[PDB]
Every structure is written in structure tokens, then in C-alpha cells.
């Protein structure tokens, strides 16, 4: 282990043609002890989905913090935040406390209702826009994911082919990740609706 990611967790975001997906494992760990099988990494505010990897206490704290920040916006402008705009909001929350900083790697996923265009982003510890629209992965299996994703990646798969491609990438990676191995939930996100599908997979 490392001090910024003792409690693990993995999130993977891809782009398809006018669709995104995002998926995560559901294992929480604390050192070598696997604690809970149900505990989601990904949370959402309106129509933008966010996974937050890292030291587990800060995932929970920013889940709450972002909800407070998003909802202040929504009520005031009378309209949903968009996943282009939402990028720079993560970047400022993370940078406010550069000294003593949040230990997370959040990954956005989402599709605009003003372009119909998939937007994914990654951020580090004190935050950055990593504005690739290749595919964006974070977590303890960061190394593992960048290769598995790359191999499979063909741009502009149909949504239901995209579900095959991200679920497979995630499952292989997880078996070989020490601090995640249990459960999975995959979000297949479209403009119209958002379908959530839990996998069935091995436990360790």
C-alpha cells in the first residue's frame, strides 16, 4: 500500500458514439481486510455521473461536498449543470487544499443535452483537466487499466457493443488488483435514460 490509496477501488470511463459508460468494483478494503461488498464508488448529481477512487474517507466526504455545490447551482439557475462545466468545478475543490490535500482520483462521465456529445475527464490529487476523450481510468489498477482499455479500444462502438467492451476490461483487471476484486456495477448512459446493470462475477 501507499498513503493515498490503502482502501483502493477502481473506476473506468470510456467513450462510444454518442454514449458514455462508466463502471466500478464495489469492494472496499482496509489494508488486507475486505470490509463491504456493497458500497458504490460512483455517485451522481442530475445527469452527470462521477466515480471517486482513493482513500475511502475522502470519497465519502466529496460525495457530500459535491452535492452541496451542485444543488446550489441547480436551484439558482433553474437548470442542470452540464458535464463540460462540471469539470472545472472538481478542479477548483481539489486545488483549494493543495496543502493537506484530498486523496482521490475522480473520473467524470456524462453526455450533454445541448450537444449530445460524450464528455469524460480525470483529475489527480490537487486536480487537473485531463481532457482526453480516448478513455480515462484512475484507481489502484490505473496501470493495469490503461493497457487493457487501449487493446480493446475501437472508437465509435454502438452502445450495446460498448457494454461488452467496458465490462470485459474491468473484469480482467479486478482479479489481478489486490485492493478491489468484489462486485461490479456498470452504468450504460445514453441521452434518453440511464440503465444501471450490476454484473455477476467472482469473489476472491
Partner 1 sequence: MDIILGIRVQDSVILASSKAVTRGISVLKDSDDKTRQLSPHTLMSFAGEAGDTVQFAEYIQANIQLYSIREDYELSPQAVSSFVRQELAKSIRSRRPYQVNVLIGGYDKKKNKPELYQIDYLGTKVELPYGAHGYSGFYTFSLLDHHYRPDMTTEEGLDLLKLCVQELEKRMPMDFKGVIVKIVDKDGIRQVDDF
Partner 2 sequence: TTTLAFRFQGGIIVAVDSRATAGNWVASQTVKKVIEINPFLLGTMAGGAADCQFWETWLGSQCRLHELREKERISVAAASKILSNLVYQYKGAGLSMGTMICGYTRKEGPTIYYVDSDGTRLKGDIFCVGSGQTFAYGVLDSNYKWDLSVEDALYLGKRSILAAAHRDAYSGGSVNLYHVTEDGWIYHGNHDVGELFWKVKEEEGSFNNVIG
Partner 3 sequence: TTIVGVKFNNGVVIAADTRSTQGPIVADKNCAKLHRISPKIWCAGAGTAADTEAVTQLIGSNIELHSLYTSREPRVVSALQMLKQHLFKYQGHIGAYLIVAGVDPTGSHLFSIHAHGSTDVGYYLSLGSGSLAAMAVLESHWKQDLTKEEAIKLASDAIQAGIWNDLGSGSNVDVCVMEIGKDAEYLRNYLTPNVREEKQKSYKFPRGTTAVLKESIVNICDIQEE
Residues that bind partner 3 (CB under 8 A): 44, 46-47, 91, 95, 98-99, 122, 124-132, 134, 142-143, 146, 151-152, 154, 157, 160-161, 163-165, 167-168, 171, 187, 193-201
Helices 159-175 and 142-152: angle between axes, nearest 10 degrees: 140
Burial class of residue 8 in the structure, from the number of CB atoms within 10 Å of its CB (0-12 exposed, 13-18 middle, 19+ buried): buried
Q: How big is the CA angle at 81 (ends 24 and 89), to the nearest 5 degrees?
A: 70
Cα–Cα distance, 109 to 89 (Å, whole number):
14
Note whether 1 binds partner 2 by CB under 8 A.
yes
Please report how close the Cβ of residue 184 comes to partner 3 at its closest, in angstroms.
Answer: 9
Report the residue number, 118 or 181, with the smaller CB distance to partner 2: 181
What's the grid cell of residue 137? 481510468
The set of residues, in sequence order, having a beta carbon less than 8 Å from that of 3 and lying 6+ positions away, is: 55, 103
Report the residue number, 16 or 29, with the smaller CB distance to partner 2: 29
Please report how close the Cβ of residue 97 comes to partner 1 at its closest, in angstroms.
Answer: 8
Choose the contact partner of 203 out of partner 2, partner 1, partner 3, none; CB within 5 to 8 A by kind: partner 2
Choose the contact partner of 196 out of partner 2, partner 1, partner 3, none; CB within 5 to 8 A by kind: partner 3
Report the residue number, 6 or 89, with the smaller CB distance to partner 2: 6
Q: Which stretch binds partner 2 (CB under 8 A): 71-79, 106-114, 124-132, 169-177?
A: 169-177
Cα–Cα distance, 203 to 191 (Å, whole number):
33
DSSP H helices in the chain: 56-77, 86-96, 142-152, 159-175
Cα–Cα distance, 129 to 88 (Å, whole number):
7
Taking the CA atoms of residue 46, residue 55, residue 32 and residue 27 in that order, the dihedral angle to the nearest 10 degrees is 0
Using CB under 8 A, list all residues that contact partner 1: 7, 28, 30, 33-36, 38-39, 55-58, 60-61, 64, 97, 100
Report the residue number, 92 or 172, with the smaller CB distance to partner 2: 172
x/- letters, 2..31, toward partner 2 (CB under 8 A)? x--x--x--------------------x-x
Amino acid at each position: 500500500s501507499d498513503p493515498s490509496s490503502i482502501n483502493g477501488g477502481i473506476v473506468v470511463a470510456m467513450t462510444g458514439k454518442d454514449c458514455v459508460a462508466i463502471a466500478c468494483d464495489l469492494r472496499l478494503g482496509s489494508q488486507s481486510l475486505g470490509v463491504s461488498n456493497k458500497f458504490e464508488k460512483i455517485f451522481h448529481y442530475g445527469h452527470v455521473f462521477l466515480g471517486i477512487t482513493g482513500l475511502a474517507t475522502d470519497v465519502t466526504t466529496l460525495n457530500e461536498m459535491f452535492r452541496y455545490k451542485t444543488n446550489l447551482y441547480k436551484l439558482k439557475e433553474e437548470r442542470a449543470i452540464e458535464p463540460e462545466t462540471f469539470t472545472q468545478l472538481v478542479s477548483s475543490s481539489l486545488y483549494e487544499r493543495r496543502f493537506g490535500p484530498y486523496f482521490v482520483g475522480p473520473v467524470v462521465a456524462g453526455i450533454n443535452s445541448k450537444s449530445g456529445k460524450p464528455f469524460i475527464a480525470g483529475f489527480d490529487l490537487i486536480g487537473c483537466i485531463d481532457e482526453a476523450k480516448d478513455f480515462i481510468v484512475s484507481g489502484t489498477a490505473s496501470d493495469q487499466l490503461f493497457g487493457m482499455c487501449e487493446s480493446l479500444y475501437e472508437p465509435n462502438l454502438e452502445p450495446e457493443d460498448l457494454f461488452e467492451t467496458i465490462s470485459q476490461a474491468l473484469l480482467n483487471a479486478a482479479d489481478r488488483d489486490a485492493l478491489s476484486g468484489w462486485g461490479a456495477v456498470v452504468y450504460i448512459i445514453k441521452k434518453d435514460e440511464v440503465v444501471k446493470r450490476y454484473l455477476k462475477m467472482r469473489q476472491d
